[PDB]
Symmetry: D2
């Protein structure tokens, strides 16, 4: 008999695993335990802090929630109104000196007139083709052109997605975008050209990763195992037993694995699965943070992401992270020396001066098809912020952050579903629910609300026979209000 | 304080309520009791038997492994079921046209084949440039079949079924399959002279060996704890007080609940709630009544009848819309050959030679005739008019000897998918939901397309699963989703019951 | 035997009849004579002059090098003609919108631009899956422009022209060009805010005499003795069975083949044929009021170098206006001519009845009349002058020195849905009796009813009588209009091979 | 001044040139003369006779006349009722042992049921594509498949046209087929599957008897046929042509009916020689077989052969057209060979009756033809296609090869042609005809006859050359205006 024995074992305490844990803890039926190699729960949804006191999310923030169950877990973890800030859900595209509001096509009235013509002409061609279309598009690129036409495709969605995915649009599938038919709204785009013409909540303290620390605090501490004591090293699927760094063995009846599915295959010493997982493609992500002295720029004022399709900066999206919360960066009274100016030069005084401060966060993608010079990427990003007029050449940088995440994005390549329906059934037959951004490799359910629910539904499947709707039918869950599953169900009321 | 109090109360023990019961009993969490005014479980899915021993139902295909687990529990021996191919035909112009109708029009006159194919070319070319969804049932038919084939079968037949025109019915209930024709399939079978039907060795169904269909539900209900049931006059509901969450029975016993699953017809529920708003709305729903007529025949089954199973009648020469050779489904649906029965009449109406009781063997026909305000039915002659229709459709020779007759009329037969149905229904169910009432079933939730036995059984399962485990009511709200997949996740033994040992 | 006998007899010396005559005179084979009830050749293509010296026609574009040859012969010096760019506008919502209308809707309010483009997007998407031809003129319009652009111009305007709704007219007469929109063209000028018209693209106009001066010159090339114009040449009876026509003075002309240029309904009456009279009475037509206005001053800049103007709106009775004074300085008196002001544009009396000098300019208007849209003969002149003020062509203070008003009973032969059904009963019957009934009202087909087409109807009718040539213009308008017709010339091989 | 001087000079007395001659002679205005290197008028529409008494047309027969003017000229040449035989217009395709009536697609009910399915399946695909098409077809092959679908294209029109033209269908244009939109009549094809107008021919002389008769109506002295009238030099700049014998004929306008590449050579005009050499054309082998017996148990038509089992693309039972196309039954002839290739037993001259088959095989730079074996290969082909029994007795054979047979409607043809003909137009040369202007679609006899008439009508009377420039226009109407007796002649 092994060291510890449980019914369902949860590996990993990012959002997926915490979902699995929260539902196991709600049901309070089968015994369970959650393990993670990091002392701090939250996975890639965590928040780092520089030596100078600037916070940086690793893996974005939730701008829309699809599940009342997700909301119920957040409300429990952070229950006071002074725990959250409310911001308008907006975003902009940086295109030819302009900040073009989202969605890009409804705002091309900001571009030069001659360029509007090329855009509308392309969309007319798409609209007429769409009138006689009788096939689904097969590649992401096909989807883009059928939706936007060539003009708008080339200005934003084509170059932007190469910077994001680090593979061409011609090599990616498009089922992941949803079942909305790939046609343009010519009347809307043209009308806005002719005329010349909804919130989210963010944690007040802790950054996004503070949510998951708070959520994890609701679990019984004795049923958790975080840090070096809980790193998994071997998974023996045949004896349903897991071995840890310190040699502790955990036997299970059913297993929810949240770790990257290729790492699971390596830890299983299963060469069939290793061969399969190596067919999956992914990009790595450089997260770069820049802390600046001063008040923020006038023209980049609200709490959003910014998209950069153009060649004059390495990053694909940036956010003025200091707008999300005053607690993401130091008080103005804190004294910090200027490390450098934005143009690259050393400062006048190395004296520690007061604030106030603001903060920019960037993302650069890397893959085998788009390599990245690691030694210059931070400087190249800072130059890009000067090129996009987000920093003046004279701005004082007081903090820099740069971390590289090997598994950044799971790529929706053409080959992905073919590979994945060989992997997930094979692990299913061994009683392993591999779920998550990299547990099941589907980006379109890979943000925080979807990932959290992948783990809830996986447990709901193990105990209560529920359908894994998020795992298998994203457009279904994304197209409805999921109000049925709640943190207090009938099952708990009736006891 | 009331007489009995439970967490979830199920009204009605037809397939829907038994689903609710099977799942409440599986979970074994909150207390419950199921009531029905009928001493015999099964509701309108039960089986009658004539004084002469002929059984008559009021046919399955299973979309859920949960349904399979419960049937396999109720009737577990291989000798409890018979397996048959899904054989069906359309009676059209002297021919038995195999289903699907459009793939077999090679049996009609050549000049008529030309009109059919011409209609379908027009449909195929329109479908190539279509950019709207069909809005009425009639629209859907013509886009699928073209004018010719629509007029021969699906237009007239559905009027006999539903007793309303195809132009006054919606079509979301048929699915999201785009309304286009397979011109090549239709055209190829015409060219080849081929006659192939939509059945085969794996296109089968199972039927209960004994008891008829209603024997399934007797068996299913037998697995429940008897003390948690209340069937018969002792279980008729008369008042449902939604505001104090208590229902009153025939004998005056009061049952108080925390959640209510109502399998009774929603117009009757509204009446029993003394709620004039809800009653007003339910009276806006449309429905037709159904006459079931059974005929027992002396002889071995005719070669003309064959292995046939259901038959469709779009034409004017008989009152019924569907017929079944019920005697092919099971040898136990009619008496042994050694049983002696007198001939009651011949199919042409004349008296037999002797009133003597002669032996069999026997065979059995079941018919269905619909009645509504726009299509009335003479209660006093429909049986005779049905038997004449059997002679006209060449199912009986004038000389066949009839040894048993059956006729029952069911007030609530089909809930009609009218254009107005969803408009009304989305006012009723939210109102009943706010009073903590899950009205589910063929008439509990009034949606025909999830109204056969497997869907309704699961309507009650999912309603219980929603009440307890926050599951989505997928069958109730997304019929095309459940119908397009194999529903393997919910099983009669889930993890929750395994992990309790 | 009758009084005169010829091989081909041409009745009427409008452009159609003069065509037949020019060709009969060229071939110089069969004998012929041309007759007309008007002492002045040119028919409804003539030019009137007011007592005060302002000329008024009732604009050419030539599809035939033969047409050019006859004009170039009649008026051969360069100073017999003036050259102008093809400049026309639509008066719409206070703006002069350059033609073609749809390429210039950028002058309309933005909210209205949206309705137009949205209507044209619908039109383009329908056109992408169209598999039928339009059946009515209205159908043709909407398929070309969409609802929005159709309602602003081509629908209301064509009603003012034809005095029948566009749904009751056919559209084969517009040609075989597919009825689809150039959405990219329209949408691009809206985005850029551009305006441009379809004018290096010129037309020529006679320097003196107006348009009817062309036809005077052309008629002068004929042998005088082969004509009979005036009261002496009015035809009163046409006896189709004895192939003889009798004149006002009782003179009988015998013919072997007859080219009748007069209105075919009058032809049926003069043939005393009750079957044909019934058939011709089935044809529909509209009457035309021509109104001329002479104004004092140098021409205003608001008018500019404009030429014809189209008026789809309800605020003036006329459908088209012409700045006749821009075509030629000799269409109105010199500045040194002295004339009294008759009235101001607002209706009031002038200060003095003294005759002041010029310069002058000249406006010409057209108003249509039919049983479906009547016209008050007693007020139309005043209603027109008010229309000029409402459309900002005249300021209320502009001084009018000449007014002109003539009404033409047979103005436009209407391309109704029923026209060809009727016409394919009338023309074969008159053909079997050896009568080539050709022309704007001789054959009643508007789309070949302007001057170059009509002149050639007469030429081709003769070429058919003598040389078995195909009557291409009469029967295949889109064919002749879609090509350059360089083969027939005023000097053919037959004439070179005889000198 | 040269030896002869006339206003219009016509080179060649095929149907085109005789058209030009008939109209010049009717107008009777400008002086004119017509020359031909052949003593016998009719060009490639003439009729040969074997030493054994069997007639064979060189260049087919007219099955429909588009112009009342053509009819008037025929009616003059042969005015008696018993000068003509009247037969039904019809043709068949030999496909998988069946004689499939024309048009092929409306009669596929004769093919096996399984082959009908692929035909109809292919045509449904074509019908659905046509419903959303917005481009015209660009190649002949595009036209075929859009009209017939793949199945029916592969059984007949694709393989048949490769045997006719000796180029792939993908390398030919399709404007020459007309303005009829490239869509299928699916309902018609399907309805006939579900359910399951004459021409006249000369009684004597074969087709070439028409042109001898039409030519007989001309004034003899204005003609010059034979070695005396072969043209050897064309000096377009001094408007003079030189003959075989050194005679010079000077002209004011020239109607050239000879093949335009030969005209370019006689002009010693290297610009034109280079341009004409870009035109593609195929040669034709005409093969006749005279057989002993009565005809096999049909009627007077052409037969089309898309399949691999015979070299020829079309065959006709020429003997059905007229009894005078072959000897009387009382005529004695020895059997030359059997259809199987063997020589007969006796050199005995036996009686008839007789019948006659005429074949056509094409040859081009992409499709060579063994001149020494093609006759035997054709006779075998007649046995393979069940037109001859292996034992039928052949009493006469005919084989002549025509270098300029068909002018090929290649994709490049119009691009090349709009450089040649306008250049010759400026030199006052009307190069018209089957090879004078190289357009197959107006290369049959009525169109060619009218090419010459209209060319004269343009030179004299300024008429539009409608047939040369608008074949679909003339083909879609009845051309009744130009007649052999016009007003111009009545008024004199
Ligand atoms: C670059 C980036 C941008 C993002 N942007 C957004 C955004 O804009 N909006 C949004 O809503 N979401 C966003 N996210 C989503 C969010 O970061 C992820 O969904 C989150 O990581 C949830 O995935 P997960 O729990 O399945 O896996 P993870 O959180 O990646 O991993 C789960 C845990 O498993 C642990 N683990 C791995 N191997 C072992 C082992 N052997 N033993 C023990 N533990 C192990 C890991 O240490 C980790 O703690 C983004 C993510 C990234 C990477």
């Amino acid at each position: 008999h092994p060291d510890i024995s449980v019914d369902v074992l949860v590996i990993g305490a990012g959002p997926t695993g915490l979902g699995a844990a929260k539902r196991l803890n709600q049901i309070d039926g089968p015994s369970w335990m959650i393990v993670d190699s990091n002392e701090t729960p939250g996975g890639l949804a965590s928040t780092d802090v520089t030596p100078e006191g600037f916070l940086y999310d690793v893996g974005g923030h939730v701008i829309f929630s699809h599940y009342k169950y997700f909301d119920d877990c957040l409300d429990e973890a952070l229950p006071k109104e002074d725990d959250w800030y409310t911001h308008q859900r907006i975003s902009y595209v940086r295109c030819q000196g302009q900040w073009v509001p989202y969605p890009f096509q409804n705002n091309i009235s900001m571009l030069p007139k001659e360029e509007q013509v090329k855009c509308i002409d392309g969309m007319i061609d798409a609209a007429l083709e769409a009138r006689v279309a009788n096939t689904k598009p097969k590649t992401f690129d096909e989807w883009i052109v059928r939706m936007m036409g060539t003009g708008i495709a080339d200005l934003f969605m084509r170059p932007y997605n190469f910077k994001v995915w680090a593979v061409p649009t011609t090599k990616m599938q498009c089922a992941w975008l949803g079942e909305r038919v790939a046609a343009p709204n010519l009347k809307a785009v043209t009308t806005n050209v002719i005329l010349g013409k909804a919130t989210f909540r963010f944690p007040a303290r802790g950054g996004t990763g503070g949510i998951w620390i708070a959520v994890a605090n609701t679990l019984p501490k004795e049923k958790t195992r975080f840090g070096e004591k809980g790193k998994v090293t071997k998974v023996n699927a045949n004896n349903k037993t897991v071995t840890l760094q310190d040699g502790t063995t955990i036997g299970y009846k059913k297993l929810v694995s949240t770790m990257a599915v290729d790492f699971l295959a390596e830890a299983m010493n299963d060469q069939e699965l290793v061969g399969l997982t190596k067919q999956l493609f992914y990009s790595s992500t450089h997260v770069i943070g820049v802390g600046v002295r001063g008040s923020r720029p006038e023209r980049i004022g609200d709490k959003c992401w910014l998209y950069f399709p153009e060649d004059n900066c390495p990053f694909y999206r940036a956010t003025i992270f200091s707008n999300y919360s005053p607690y993401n960066q130091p008080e103005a009274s804190a004294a910090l020396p200027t490390m450098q100016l934005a143009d690259g030069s050393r400062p006048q005084s190395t004296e520690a001066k007061e604030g106030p401060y603001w903060s920019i966060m960037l993302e650069v993608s890397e893959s085998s098809m788009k390599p990245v010079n690691q030694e210059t990427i931070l400087a190249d990003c800072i130059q890009g912020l000067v090129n996009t007029e987000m920093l003046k050449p004279t701005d004082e940088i007081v903090s820099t952050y740069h971390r590289r995440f090997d598994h950044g994005y799971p790529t929706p390549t053409l080959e992905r579903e073919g590979t994945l329906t060989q992997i997930l059934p094979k692990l299913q037959d061994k009683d392993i629910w591999s779920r998550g951004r990299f547990g099941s490799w589907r980006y379109e359910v890979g943000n925080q609300d979807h990932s959290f629910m992948l783990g809830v539904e996986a447990v709901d499947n193990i105990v209560n026979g529920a359908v894994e709707l998020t795992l298998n039918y994203p457009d279904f869950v994304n197209g409805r209000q999921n109000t049925e599953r709640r943190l207090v169900d009938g099952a708990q009321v009736f006891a």
